[PDB]
Design a protein around this ligand. Structure first.
Ligand SMILES: CC1(C)S[C@@H]([C@H](NC(=O)Cc2ccccc2)C(=O)O)N[C@H]1C(=O)O
Length: 263
């Protein structure tokens, strides 16, 4: 069946010229709303949540892991390193790297998280351990953002990512302390005001992780606390036909608005 909300999302997609994927979980009743929910999309930076969460999982059995120093060398710098560049020829702890990857989307920090997990396959292995059979990380930064249409590398589906984000932030995929840390990091994100958040009533609070890549790929995944009701988990993925397409965070805001108005 096609719902009123799905019809509005289809209209939005049509006017956007691209391909939109949406997955909402309303924890008030566990109901879901999906649009292209089982189609694959390039994750880009939204994959940083899985990497940080995997390191948080490791920290459950190593109390000092998050304080472990990691060397940052000039050769480690990639295409976007707002935090790591300050620490070249020095070190950053795994907590510092996690916070930089999540809150500033630092790509060198993400690479250190991936390395700590034994490579992209280590991130995928953690996804499998928490019941996500869909997620796949295949490359490091910056190539994991090529976002080529039809390419399965570094992709997931909106349904899978929403389920995983719910388990990580509201469920028991991580220990209580680690879940709280992840939520704190997401709520402190600096990059999300133009995306899902721009489509929500101002009174609502949220934590999110954005992503962008080639093909005008523009993504956001969020955990939301609406005024007067149980939290929501929302994933909005968007990708376009031309490699050099411009970002469209406004499309994510529009999708979020349709979802909020549809509650
Ligand atoms: C500036 C950021 C905050 S960081 C960046 C990052 N993507 C890239 O570096 C690849 C790329 C390749 C070609 C064009 C754009 C991006 C990611 O997905 O985390 N995403 C932005 C965001 O989330 O708003």
């Amino acid at each position: 069946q096609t719902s009123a909300v799905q019809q509005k999302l289809a209209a939005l997609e049509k006017s956007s010229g691209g391909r939109l994927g949406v997955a909402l979980i309303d924890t008030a009743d566990n109901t879901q709303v999906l649009y292209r929910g089982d189609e694959r999309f390039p994750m880009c930076g939204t994959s940083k949540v899985m990497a940080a969460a995997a390191v948080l999982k490791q920290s459950e059995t190593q109390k000092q892991l998050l304080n472990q120093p990691v060397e940052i060398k000039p050769a480690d710098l990639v295409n976007y390193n707002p935090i790591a560049e300050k620490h070249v020829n020095g070190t950053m702890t795994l907590a510092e790297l996690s916070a930089a990857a999540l809150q500033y989307s630092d790509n060198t920090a993400m690479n250190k998280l991936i390395a700590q997990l034994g490579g992209p396959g280590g991130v995928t292995a953690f996804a499998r351990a928490i019941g996500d059979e869909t997620f796949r990380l295949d490359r490091t930064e910056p190539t994991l953002n090529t976002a080529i249409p039809g390419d399965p590398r570094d992709t997931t589906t909106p349904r899978a990512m929403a389920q995983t984000l719910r388990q990580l932030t509201l469920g028991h995929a991580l220990g209580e302390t680690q879940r709280a840390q992840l939520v704190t990091w997401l709520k402190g994100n600096t990059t999300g005001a133009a995306s899902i958040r721009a489509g929500l009533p101002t009174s609502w609070t949220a934590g999110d992780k954005t992503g962008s890549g080639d093909y005008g790929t523009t993504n956001d995944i969020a955990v939301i606390w609406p005024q007067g009701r149980a939290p929501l988990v929302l994933v909005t993925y968007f990708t376009q036909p031309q490699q050099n397409a411009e970002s469209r965070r406004d499309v994510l805001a529009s999708a979020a608005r349709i979802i909020a108005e549809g509650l």
